[PDB]
Amino acid sequence: ALRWGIVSVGLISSDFTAVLQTLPRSEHQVVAVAARDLSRAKEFAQKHDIPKAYGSYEELAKDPNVEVAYVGTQHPQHKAAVMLCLAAGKAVLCEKPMGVNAAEVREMVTEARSRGLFLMEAIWTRFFPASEALRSVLAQGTLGDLRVARAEFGKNLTHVPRAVDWAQAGGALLDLGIYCVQFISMVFGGQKPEKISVMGRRHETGVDDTVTVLLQYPGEVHGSFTCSITAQLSNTASVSGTKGMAQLLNPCWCPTELVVKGEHKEFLLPPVPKNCNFDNGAGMSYEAKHVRECLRKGLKESPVIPLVESELLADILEEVRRAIGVTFPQD
Amino acid sequence: ALRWGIVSVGLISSDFTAVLQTLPRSEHQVVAVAARDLSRAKEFAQKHDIPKAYGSYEELAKDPNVEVAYVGTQHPQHKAAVMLCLAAGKAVLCEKPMGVNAAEVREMVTEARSRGLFLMEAIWTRFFPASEALRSVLAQGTLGDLRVARAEFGKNLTHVPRAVDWAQAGGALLDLGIYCVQFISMVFGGQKPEKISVMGRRHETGVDDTVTVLLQYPGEVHGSFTCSITAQLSNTASVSGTKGMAQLLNPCWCPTELVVKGEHKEFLLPPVPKNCNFDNGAGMSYEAKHVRECLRKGLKESPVIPLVESELLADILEEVRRAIGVTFPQD
Secondary structure: OEEEEEEOOOHHHHHHHHHHOOOOOOOEEEEEEEOOOHHHHHHHHHHHOOOEEEOOHHHHHOOOOOOEEEEOOOHHHHHHHHHHHHHOOOEEEEOOOOOOOHHHHHHHHHHHHHHOOOEEEOOHHHHOHHHHHHHHHHHHOOOOOEEEEEEEEEOOOOOOHHHHOOOOOOOHHHHHHHHHHHHHHHHOOOOOOOEEEEEEEEOOOOOEEEEEEEEEEOOOEEEEEEEEOOOOOOOOEEEEEOOEEEEEOOOOOOOOEEEEOOEEEEOOOOOOOOOOOOOOHHHHHHHHHHHHHHHHOOOOOOOOOOHHHHHHHHHHHHHHHHHOOOOOOOO | OEEEEEEOOOHHHHHHHHHHOOOOOOOEEEEEEEOOOHHHHHHHHHHHOOOEEEOOHHHHHOOOOOOEEEEOOOHHHHHHHHHHHHHOOOEEEEOOOOOOOHHHHHHHHHHHHHHOOOEEEOOHHHHOHHHHHHHHHHHHOOOOOEEEEEEEEEOOOOOOHHHHOOOOOOOHHHHHHHHHHHHHHHHOOOOOOOEEEEEEEEOOOOOEEEEEEEEEEOOOEEEEEEEEOOOOOOOOEEEEEOOEEEEEOOOOOOOOEEEEOOEEEEOOOOOOOOOOOOOOHHHHHHHHHHHHHHHHOOOOOOOOOOHHHHHHHHHHHHHHHHHOOOOOOOO
16 A cells, blocks of 8 residues: 655645545555644544654654655645655655745755655646546647636635735735646646736735736747635636637636536546535545556656646746735745 | 617618617607618618618718717728718717727717717627626625626637628727727726736737737726637626625626626516527617617716727727737728
8 A cells, every 4th residue: 555644734634634544445544644743643643543643744754654745734834844755765745836936846856856756746636537537628629729728716715814824925826826827737738838927916914915817828829817815706717729618617726517618527526525624625535546656657756747847837926926026035 | 759870781780770679669760771882771771661771871971860870880981980970960879899999989089079979889788787787786895895807708700701801800809809898997997007918819811819918907906808709718707806706697798697796686688679680689779778868968978988988998909909919001
């Protein structure tokens, strides 16, 4: 079985652990958990039935029984935890955005490559059957010659402290725009944009509030997205060509409905777990199964979210964020 | 009754005439029609039951029985027909876009103002009960402090010769983007944008094919739109603020459904006429009734689409069109 170590005991780690514990026991095992103190770790390990608990991340990195570490820390804490795990010889699945700026992502990627270890950014959206079906639609040329892509993800998150916290690298772009950027990149084959134009405004807590981006892609096609931590948006994503449009319906970031040229297709989520911290949290199963498949095949990265693309997505996000003057100490 | 003269006998004039002839007979009368030849005019006048037909527009302009002229010619032919009618002392309702560039619109507006005559651009969308309801939502502050607006209008129109004809000033922006620009302008109070960013590509017939625009508006809000004459889009329009979103559903350019913070409201079209040349053509009744009301009140323009706004919308469209290098002889 693939032996998982869980880094941090917050909401996303709870969901991911719950998901892993629904999977075939011959395929996945959760063998260890770490928190920044023993008490928090022991409690999580008891609730989620994990045989080993640690009071530091370094201890989990050094556990010989752990094959892959899931890094579920807050945004600014990803890099050091990933670097620890890789230095200790673990494969790593790191929560999104992998780092808070392009330099952090380059550092993690360089480390994984130099050590010959698997690293993947947990962009779970890409593994949903609805997103895979969209990629097939594109490969088959069903929409004709492409023209434009569009994505939006906006919700009022002002009462989610983490989401609007400058110190935790929150804001529209790093919480929500990451899903828009990955979608547009996916539809246009992970290609580097030729030009980016940005408009947006800041929030009173120091983060970005609402941001729209226009991206020129090669071959005379372009994409745009809007993200917001104050304003509710349609939360759909679409791509259109000379023969028609395909859309991923709300919630686009964990989609179960694809519409192609007016035809609706539904892709049910796994039945468990129910009541996750996050919308459609059961859908994390898809990326967990993908990580196992990659490692079984001896891969050091995913062909679905390659490390060069994670670097490009971070380049884009940073460029956007700087275009409207939002800086982090890490920059 | 308000006495209408119809200029040109094409598809849009057919729809508008059909609509006028459903209205109270004490309120509207269609008294004359002109075409570029007598034969075409007589046939239209017979089909639509109009007592007088003319073989030139100048003849209709000079008809003392006509109070208001409807100018339904192709795009490049609007200006000369409007100028004729105004010179002869007629109020004018001119089809959209009023002119093919900002200079044409300025010329028509200056002429109407100097002669003290009513002129309005027939942006029929603005008079739909769904659009008026949206304006009320905005006036009441229901969406909170605004953040962003979005509109799209894309359909494959490559088999509608007029739509893609360079000589007739067709293309995505002048056929479809005009509806997106007017929507964004409406939601942001007809204010002049502070900055415009454009990406797009040309079509093989010499017109623009697909264009996306980002518009910075005053007070840290912005809008974007995408239009296309090849690619089908969602064809919805929305505005979002800190308390929620309002959307006009497809077809956004002649809308009958408004969704506000998840609550759906339907606004039925008038029952006749049926089978118009254009989608929801019965909805032209709203602008016809508005023109009568303005003239009864002695207005020389509409407060809903003032001439300064028609000039601004033309400024924007032209700027966009030039940003991607699409020029007309008239420029």
